[PDB]
Design a protein around this ligand. Structure first.
Ligand SMILES: Cc1cc2nc3c(=O)[nH]c(=O)nc-3n(C[C@H](O)[C@H](O)[C@H](O)COP(=O)(O)OP(=O)(O)OC[C@H]3O[C@@H](n4cnc5c(N)ncnc54)[C@H](O)[C@@H]3O)c2cc1C
Ligand SMILES: CCC[C@@H](O)C(=O)O
Length: 456
């Protein structure tokens, strides 16, 4: 990367906001996944959208790859600079704007995390529900199409992103639904907002997100329920969903994951396949939901509910940290996560089969999942230096992905494709789907410089 080019970057954002130092680049060459660190040639921190546009235009016209970087909590290598280039760290743009409580909407810049937003909304009666376990950039969550434990009731990022401000690869500024617009529904033209949700930085740089806010629940009850088997817990889940109980949260942990979470969070739950549940409503509605949900779990051997403000917070913090609890089982190890999502009636088959396959293999695995969506993660620890183990781990993850595809599902419910699931995506949507996706990529990024090597 030439000195003239570095000076041009510094001319846009300021000398303190450009770095070519080895250690700074290495810190931006990886995310939380096992994908090997591939450092960008430089890291740049733009301070406003005009600077994002000018950095993108500089890189694009000089043939330099661009890698958007939020909080680096992704798990599919999205920020790995596989072709070098300029990593654009967006988190100094950290303002909340256009809070419209009467309309249930807000605009956030990439440095705003869900914690920051919900703290800012404290005492407003509103909250933002999509809750990945990591303290992630909300614009990064839009870029990956994230979900969370609350999505079963309150929707994913795709359900709750109303508008996006996007710097296209060549620097042009796009407001996907129109500048300043926010509304409940539209048939005006083609829906561009949904194209950029889940684009993982390969179609442009999200510099603001307009988000749907939700009313805080009148009352909340959380509980845990222990089961004799994975089959019993997942059968309960399917039956709760088929009975249309509007549960706020329904999360599965297998016995391995529950033990790991116990050890990492000083919970003391019985070591068993377990559901973490939460219910929202009036006291009337809560009693009815609990009534109907306890009857279903009882039919499948579930324990009496172990009830959980402070404990509920500790319960869900333990769940949100499941990934780190799993990594702590074998210290020094990294991990890969699967993320399949299947039609809910097929969820018992594939979780029970996954548990059986884990036991039949030399691999360690913990299972945790947004099972209310038909989604779960297998977290597979890896010794970073054991090449034989890593390719058993990819073989396992790749077979699980293909089993989900055979059941009519998808290879990723929320994490995305990144570097890890590119072949599975080709199998998932077939040749005409791949070509159509590539045609969209090509019209927005003709030179192929927008996070190359990812998704397609
Ligand atoms: C403990 C833990 C729990 C998690 N739980 C969940 C969960 O429940 N659900 C879930 O969906 N994910 C979960 N994740 C994964 C991760 O937090 C999400 O994928 C999150 O959306 C990533 O945001 P980020 O800014 O950290 O992404 P990064 O790693 O910075 O980037 C991810 C990808 O998006 C691109 N990108 C980032 N910001 C932008 C932007 N502004 N514009 C364009 N492209 C951009 C990057 O180029 C990259 O390809 C979890 C991760 C951890 C570590
Ligand atoms: C990063 C894999 C686990 C994550 O998806 C979660 O559900 O907490």
């Amino acid at each position: 990367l030439s000195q003239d080019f570095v000076e041009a970057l510094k001319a846009v954002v300021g000398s303190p906001h450009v770095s070519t130092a080895s250690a700074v680049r290495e810190q931006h060459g990886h995310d939380e996944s096992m994908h090997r660190c591939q450092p960008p040639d430089a890291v740049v921190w733009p301070q406003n959208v005009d600077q994002v546009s000018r950095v993108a235009s500089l890189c694009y016209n000089q043939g330099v790859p661009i890698i958007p970087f939020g909080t680096g909590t992704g798990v599919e290598g999205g920020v790995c600079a596989v072709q070098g280039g300029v990593c654009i760290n967006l988190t100094h743009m950290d303002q909340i704007t256009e809070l419209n409580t009467e309309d249930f909407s807000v605009v956030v810049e990439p440095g705003v995390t869900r914690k920051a937003l919900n703290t800012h909304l404290r005492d407003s009666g509103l909250w933002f529900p999509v809750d990945p376990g990591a303290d992630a950039s909300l614009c990064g969550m839009a870029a990956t199409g994230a979900s969370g434990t609350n999505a079963v009731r309150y929707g994913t990022m795709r359900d709750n992103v109303i508008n996006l401000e996007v710097v296209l690869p060549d620097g042009r500024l796009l407001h996907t639904a129109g500048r300043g617009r926010h509304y409940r529904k539209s048939a005006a033209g083609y829906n561009l907002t949904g194209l950029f949700v889940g684009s993982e930085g390969t179609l442009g740089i999200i510099t603001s997100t307009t988000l749907r806010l939700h009313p805080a629940p009148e009352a909340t009850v959380a509980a845990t329920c222990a089961f004799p088997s994975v089959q019993a817990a997942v059968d309960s889940t399917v039956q709760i969903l088929q009975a249309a109980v509007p549960v706020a949260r329904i999360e599965f942990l297998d016995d391995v994951m529950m033990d790991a979470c116990n050890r990492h969070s000083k919970l003391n739950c019985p070591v068993a396949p377990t559901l973490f549940l939460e219910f929202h409503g009036s006291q009337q509605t809560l009693a009815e939901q609990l009534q109907r949900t306890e009857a279903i779990t009882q039919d499948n051997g579930g324990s009496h509910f172990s009830w959980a403000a402070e404990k509920r917070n500790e319960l869900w913090a333990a769940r949100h940290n499941a990934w780190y609890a799993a990594l702590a089982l074998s210290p020094g190890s990294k991990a890969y996560s699967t993320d399949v999502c299947v039609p809910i009636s097929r969820l018992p088959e594939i979780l029970v089969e996954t548990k059986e396959e884990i036991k039949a293999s030399k691999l360690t695995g913990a299972i945790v999942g947004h099972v209310g969506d038909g989604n779960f993660a297998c977290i597979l620890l890896v010794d970073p230096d054991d090449a034989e183990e890593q390719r058993r781990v990819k073989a396992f993850a790749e077979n699980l992905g293909r089993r989900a595809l055979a059941l009519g599902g998808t290879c990723t419910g929320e994490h995305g494709i990144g570097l890890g699931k590119r072949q599975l995506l080709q199998e998932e949507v077939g040749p005409v789907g791949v070509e159509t996706m590539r045609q969209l990529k090509n019209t927005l990024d003709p030179r192929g410089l927008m996070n190359p090597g990812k998704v397609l």
